[PDB]
Amino acid sequence: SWSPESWRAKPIQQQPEYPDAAHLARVEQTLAGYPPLVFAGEARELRRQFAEVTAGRAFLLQGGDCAESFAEFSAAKIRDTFKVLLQMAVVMTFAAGCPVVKVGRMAGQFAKPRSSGDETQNGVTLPAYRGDIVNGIGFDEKSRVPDPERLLQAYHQSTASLNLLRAFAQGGFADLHQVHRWNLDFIANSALAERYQQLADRIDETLAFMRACGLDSAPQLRETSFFTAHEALLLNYEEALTRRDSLTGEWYDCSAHMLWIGDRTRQIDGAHVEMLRGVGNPIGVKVGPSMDSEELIRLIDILNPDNDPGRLNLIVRMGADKVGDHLPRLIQAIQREGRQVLWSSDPMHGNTIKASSGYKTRDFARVLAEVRQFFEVHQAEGSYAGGIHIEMTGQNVTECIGGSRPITEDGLSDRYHTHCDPRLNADQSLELAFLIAETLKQVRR
Amino acid sequence: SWSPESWRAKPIQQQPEYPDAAHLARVEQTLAGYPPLVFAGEARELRRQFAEVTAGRAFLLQGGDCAESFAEFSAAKIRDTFKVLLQMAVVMTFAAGCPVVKVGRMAGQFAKPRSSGDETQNGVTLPAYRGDIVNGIGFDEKSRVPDPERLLQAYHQSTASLNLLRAFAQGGFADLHQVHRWNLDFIANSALAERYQQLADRIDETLAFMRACGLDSAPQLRETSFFTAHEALLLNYEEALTRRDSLTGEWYDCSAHMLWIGDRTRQIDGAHVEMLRGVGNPIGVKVGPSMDSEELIRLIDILNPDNDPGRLNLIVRMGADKVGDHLPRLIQAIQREGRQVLWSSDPMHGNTIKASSGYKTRDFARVLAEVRQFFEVHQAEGSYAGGIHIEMTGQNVTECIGGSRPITEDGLSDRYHTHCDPRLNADQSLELAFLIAETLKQVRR
Amino acid sequence: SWSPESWRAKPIQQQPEYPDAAHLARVEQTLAGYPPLVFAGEARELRRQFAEVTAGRAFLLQGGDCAESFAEFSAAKIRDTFKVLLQMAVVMTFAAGCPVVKVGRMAGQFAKPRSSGDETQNGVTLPAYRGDIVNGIGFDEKSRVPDPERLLQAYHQSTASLNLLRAFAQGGFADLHQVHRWNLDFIANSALAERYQQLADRIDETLAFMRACGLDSAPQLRETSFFTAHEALLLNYEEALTRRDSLTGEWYDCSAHMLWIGDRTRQIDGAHVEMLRGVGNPIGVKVGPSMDSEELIRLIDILNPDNDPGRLNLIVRMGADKVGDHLPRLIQAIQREGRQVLWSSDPMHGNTIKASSGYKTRDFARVLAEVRQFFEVHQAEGSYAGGIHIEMTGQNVTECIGGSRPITEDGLSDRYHTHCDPRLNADQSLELAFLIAETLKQVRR
Amino acid sequence: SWSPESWRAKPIQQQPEYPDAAHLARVEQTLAGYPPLVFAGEARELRRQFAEVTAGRAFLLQGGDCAESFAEFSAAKIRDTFKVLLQMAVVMTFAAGCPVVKVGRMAGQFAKPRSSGDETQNGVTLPAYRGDIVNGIGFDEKSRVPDPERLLQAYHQSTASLNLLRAFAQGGFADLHQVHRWNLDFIANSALAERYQQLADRIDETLAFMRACGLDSAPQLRETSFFTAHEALLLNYEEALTRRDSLTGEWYDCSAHMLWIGDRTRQIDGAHVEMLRGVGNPIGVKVGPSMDSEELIRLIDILNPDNDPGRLNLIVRMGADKVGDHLPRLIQAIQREGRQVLWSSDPMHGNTIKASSGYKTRDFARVLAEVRQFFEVHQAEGSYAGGIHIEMTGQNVTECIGGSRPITEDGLSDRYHTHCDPRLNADQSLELAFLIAETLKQVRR
Ligand SMILES: N[C@@H](Cc1c[nH]c2ccccc12)C(=O)O
Ligand SMILES: N[C@@H](Cc1c[nH]c2ccccc12)C(=O)O
Ligand SMILES: N[C@@H](Cc1c[nH]c2ccccc12)C(=O)O
Ligand SMILES: N[C@@H](Cc1c[nH]c2ccccc12)C(=O)O
Ligand SMILES: [Cl-]
Ligand SMILES: [Cl-]
Ligand SMILES: [Cl-]
Ligand SMILES: [Cl-]
Ligand SMILES: [Cl-]
Ligand SMILES: [Cl-]
Ligand SMILES: [Cl-]
Ligand SMILES: [Cl-]
Ligand SMILES: [Co+2]
Ligand SMILES: [Co+2]
Ligand SMILES: [Co+2]
Numbered sequence A, B, C, D: 001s002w003s004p005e006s007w008r009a010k011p012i013q014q015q016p017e018y019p020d021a022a023h024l025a026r027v028e029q030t031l032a033g034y035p036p037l038v039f040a041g042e043a044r045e046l047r048r049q050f051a052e053v054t055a056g057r058a059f060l061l062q063g064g065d066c067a068e069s070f071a072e073f074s075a076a077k078i079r080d081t082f083k084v085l086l087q088m089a090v091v092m093t094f095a096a097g098c099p100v101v102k103v104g105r106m107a108g109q110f111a112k113p114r115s116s117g118d119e120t121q122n123g124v125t126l127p128a129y130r131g132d133i134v135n136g137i138g139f140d141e142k143s144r145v146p147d148p149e150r151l152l153q154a155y156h157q158s159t160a161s162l163n164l165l166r167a168f169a170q171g172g173f174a175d176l177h178q179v180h181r182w183n184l185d186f187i188a189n190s191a192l193a194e195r196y197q198q199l200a201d202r203i204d205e206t207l208a209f210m211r212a213c214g215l216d217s218a219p220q221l222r223e224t225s226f227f228t229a230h231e232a233l234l235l236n237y238e239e240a241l242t243r244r245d246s247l248t249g250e251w252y253d254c255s256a257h258m259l260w261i262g263d264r265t266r267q268i269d270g271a272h273v274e275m276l277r278g279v280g281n282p283i284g285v286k287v288g289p290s291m292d293s294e295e296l297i298r299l300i301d302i303l304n305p306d307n308d309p310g311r312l313n314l315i316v317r318m319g320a321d322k323v324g325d326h327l328p329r330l331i332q333a334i335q336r337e338g339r340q341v342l343w344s345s346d347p348m349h350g351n352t353i354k355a356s357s358g359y360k361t362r363d364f365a366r367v368l369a370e371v372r373q374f375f376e377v378h379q380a381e382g383s384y385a386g387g388i389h390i391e392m393t394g395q396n397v398t399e400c401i402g403g404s405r406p407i408t409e410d411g412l413s414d415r416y417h418t419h420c421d422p423r424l425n426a427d428q429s430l431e432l433a434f435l436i437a438e439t440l441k442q443v444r445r
């Protein structure tokens, strides 16, 4: 049997050590009384859309932050990342004639899993930084001791962020008439920028035609659905925000529409699998090179016992060198056992190089290579390449190498070569969108 | 005061001499008891659409037969002419983003005005052929004596023709998914054929996008309004088919949605002006080189005393040599007197050359030149070039010279160089549509 | 193998004896060259709607003339019968929340099957009157000899009638704002008239609500689909109007959307079954008391070999005394053999009493009793009561007894007590519609 | 000239005395960097809807808290108040056929104007409670000293509240299929409860009809616009949340869609008028008995110099005894000077009785009397009664006397008889909605 607190009886990885259990429990009770971020009916609607993807009738775009931070809590940052997501979505929707399910890694993507539980600099060892929802990035004792009050700050940043995202999605910002406005000003003077401009002009002509034909009325042209997701890592936060549906009695984790389990926390007997087992949300699991086909099926039996086609997103992150060797055997097992899953590529988390110094690099060419091979593997196996899962930014930076132009090495990006990972910029994201749109069009041809 | 028979008190041109007045009256009474071709509410809807054109928010496409004939009463002929009209309309709608009001010279365009009331061949003089609704094309006494029973045959051909047209317009034939099917098979292996194909592909992509966005539902994508028109020439026919609106009591000529007065029958004190004065239909007048600005205004005072913007279509047919010299003074008068009119170009009837032999030629280059100059004159005067009025066919023939390829001289086309006039073929009609679409796009830019 | 003329090799009932075979063949060739009444795509759309009925998601309303006549060829008669059909449809649609498929016995219901091939009055025996498409109602030699030219007159009346019906259905007459206007002025000063008025007011409030909510735009509120049907009896007419679909090559009888075989002409080895076997239209068969379950299945095997759910309408006409005894065994056979059929009640043709004099009476109470029992039988068997098939008129007459008020005995109705049968009037039709709407609401509850 | 800080140069009423100016300024800067609650485009959309009301084509429903509190920050409270607003809106929309603009006094209605700047209990005098955004309700020094950190707590409660409201409005909670679910369980066993049930059933029948007709698709049936409003009282909060529109450069107060000036702070030379003068939001002004016609016009000149019809809501709160004597002269002045305003009734704030003890009572019968007279006055003057502005709750309490049943005297309601004012409950709100719906229907008849 399941409860929102049943995870606490299981073995668990990646959790902080709080210094005062009672203080933690007080903050958890405060949070438990605060309004949810999402309505259960919305999570059901995302499941319905996931089922369209799983059936090959739509495509899942999931994108946003590596890890959101309290020091970057602005409307401009939120807006500009949303613009990139809209630009990618409209490229794929128009060029491929394919509905796109838009899910942001936003409004709650704070907690970060770490390779090591501690960090050492020149003879001093402190607890690892686990994201702003747990502790601070500064290498000092006060910063690194987990502080339960950070749960509430994360909640407050999430409600402000999602309120604004809902306002943009429904209130006119995402109206198709605004297609040119979604292109960030630093996408310019290039073949890619021209390509988007031309596509946007084709959309203008489409809308003018639909107006001349007597439509243009349709609310679908003026708004779009937008959903949120994050890794369900800090289960104290997730439990506090887990709530029963008023109508059905069924539990939903209402911190976000979609929750996923990370590659380091997907132990079948573990806490994270136990938490998501019993919520009604659509959910995801990160599937890295260590996953074999036997243990994948066992995980699916726990996380989707009814084999519902909108329930489960398998987010494959193998690396450009391993996707061809590892993915086919997993697909074959799913096909053999008749399982309904939404397959996505995370082409980023398997393609990070960490130097001895700790400095992280991601080569955009390896990113693109993994995406190309992911579609190739699905094509060979007769299965459906259903989505893309990326870390990106609307900021005018270059964090991944191998792009058209060289990396920028701004201090604001230092976080994204050490504690976090390198994100795609708008140019890279747009190039990826065009690649996917061409690939989808050929699949649907 | 007005009645459906008040025209009979006026001087009249272009009427046949029937041999038995009582026989004529019996056929008129039979017809008066037959159902109308159109519903008054439909004529009102066309007036509403004419008002959109007059205001510069739409464009009027009027096209079809020089004169319909009893010997060419087929579904294939009707369908193929309708295809050309759809192809022209969709080109202008998509390329210019402009609603197109589609009106066919069909389902009643039988009566023909003639330069001479008789015809002489080798010492024998007979009454002129005035169209199948009056008499027969054969040069012999029996054929040429007006036969009132031909009124009923024309009525029956009209109901069959319009029934089929309504079925095509509403029943799926004009669904935008059928855009490729409207291109006749002899439009091929040319730059123009490729141009339409490419536009049709853009429409497919538009519809696929609208489906991906969640529309594609809209009935407007599956059907289109279609209206009929003919010259109100044989007033016996028009009177019999003139009926009172059930709801409003007001009279409509229900032989067609739109009726026009020909260039030879527009005498301000004459029968034809008197007939149309008192019906509620949208109406047209042919305006040739003989029209001065004073008498135009006097005509408008009679035909549109309330200055209703959906009432009156001025159909300008000057010839490519005269449109620049004659049209500006007419527009200036309309602007000065604040009159609301829909200006159309008939670029055909002012560009016919009749040799001493009687053989008629129309140079497509002169046709295009008059259209170009018509738009030029409106541009210079600040008025709106609101429509095109053409004679065309879906048959695989070439009747007008100066086209990409030479004229065909098929016997079926002999009618159209003697009694009737040369029609545009599908290639010419499509070339014209692209010219207009480019011109409209530049007007709306 | 099948052709439009393959029926001519089979045994045939109910056909006229034409005096000149060559003359008949000339008229058939003339007709074969005239435009069709319907487009094959439309017949396909009606099949799609029949499939909705068969699945229990809609209801079939079929109504119109016993037999159309040349002497009653008016717009008013056509309009007023259409009003009754609209009133019945809107009652069932609004009160039961059930889509209604509207099919008129109109624009071609001329040929009549007869009990006897001749008629005798005071020592003189003449061929039976078989409807105006064959011969005349007058009891004299000239009238009764079949005249092939009547095929063309029937065609011409049909195109005029259907043109007008299409105009009403699509052009505004059937806009839901016109709901009060469909009530004929002689429905007044009664509980039934008040009941319709109140329902019409509820529709007004619905439309005002939808306008206030931001809809009211929808073309579905302004137009409705309308289809035609008649008994395929005079196969010469049907063959001439049978045409190949341009796109698919498949044959459709394009005289009407739906054709049915009469109770006297449904011999499994006969001409009428052979004709309809090979056309693509939705079709019907009249099923009277003489039908057993074995021969029904054999008929279905011929007429619907692929068991398509939109193909076949079984039109049950048993009489109020026999429907309970005869229908259950037929339903059981269809259920046992897994056949997909649309079951309708014709509650009129099994409830006619013919006196020794020849005078026909129909008791409206028996009509209602058969309808009630038809729904009862379906309820008991777990099958779907899918439609109603009636003979009705918009004329201010009373032809069936047992109505609220007594029969009128107008001369115009004498036809409908001798050669034709008594029709329901508007009051009776409305009462029936309310009965059906209540019954459907209880089925869907 | 105007800036977001120009109010600071003007004389000002109702402001707190903060103990540390620098601390206040630090919190203001923090807030100034946080995301806005609303998008400027949304405020423009509300102006567009206000213009519909002003023109007599819609009705404004504004309702919610007297003053929101930190101790009542729940999803249930937010949801249940939203249910009441939906129930009122759907009653007026369906029964009157009138679009309703829905605006909640929610997500920011914290600051309260007070009659006295201090409060004395048994020889101790402390600063007045001014709402949770300023200080605490407890009568003690620590509670009553203004604390600038409360600005941030109010912001955080507002983003959580509006996020949830947006989720309900767009995400399915406000789908018209949910009409029964908006009725709170304690509305039952009464004529009023039956009346709503019956109306909800009529809506179900409407939706079933629209489904049967082929609609039911429309996104307008599934979602609704919802906007927020509060009194712009604490100008420090408003200034921090005032932001420039990205596209137009123009300033909007992005704390809420609509802001109003209270009856005690509407001095024409004062700070509150100065603040709202220069923002682009739709705005309101409370108009009490002290307002004369000369000073109203002068206020309108400042707050709506362009006489835009969507800009200004005059919220009339006179008391049931004074509305008839005071309102007509104000309307006459507006009509004489050609001003475009949206007239609303606040029938609550002029109908409070404060005993010597301080205990506040509001008689629901006086509330209804003022509303009735407000509509009467507009009817007499030829102007439009455009909206209602109420304080209400979804809690199962009775705070206003004169209701069907007696007041409850729950401790949770003690706030609403001392510091705040008595709110309407769901029964009272529904009764009011029916009164208004009947009145609107008669206006539109
Ligand atoms: N009904 C729309 C679109 C449309 C349908 N079929 C068409 C054919 C040609 C042009 C446009 C259309 C219109 O008339 O504009
Ligand atoms: N609402 C549609 C169309 C749409 C609106 N805005 C968008 C932005 C991007 C992509 C599509 C859209 C959809 O989500 O598909
Ligand atoms: N969207 C429509 C209909 C609607 C949906 N939900 C509502 C709730 C109440 C009133 C109306 C509605 C409107 O706002 O009018
Ligand atoms: N077009 C819809 C609604 C409709 C329009 N006119 C009608 C007349 C009767 C019944 C329904 C309708 C339908 O056929 O259902
Ligand atoms: Cl909750
Ligand atoms: Cl690579
Ligand atoms: Cl008529
Ligand atoms: Cl030329
Ligand atoms: Cl054909
Ligand atoms: Cl009986
Ligand atoms: Cl901002
Ligand atoms: Cl009172
Ligand atoms: Co990362
Ligand atoms: Co001509
Ligand atoms: Co009969």
Ligand SMILES: [Co+2]
Binding pocket: D066, D349, D391, D420, D421
């Ligand atoms: Co108050």
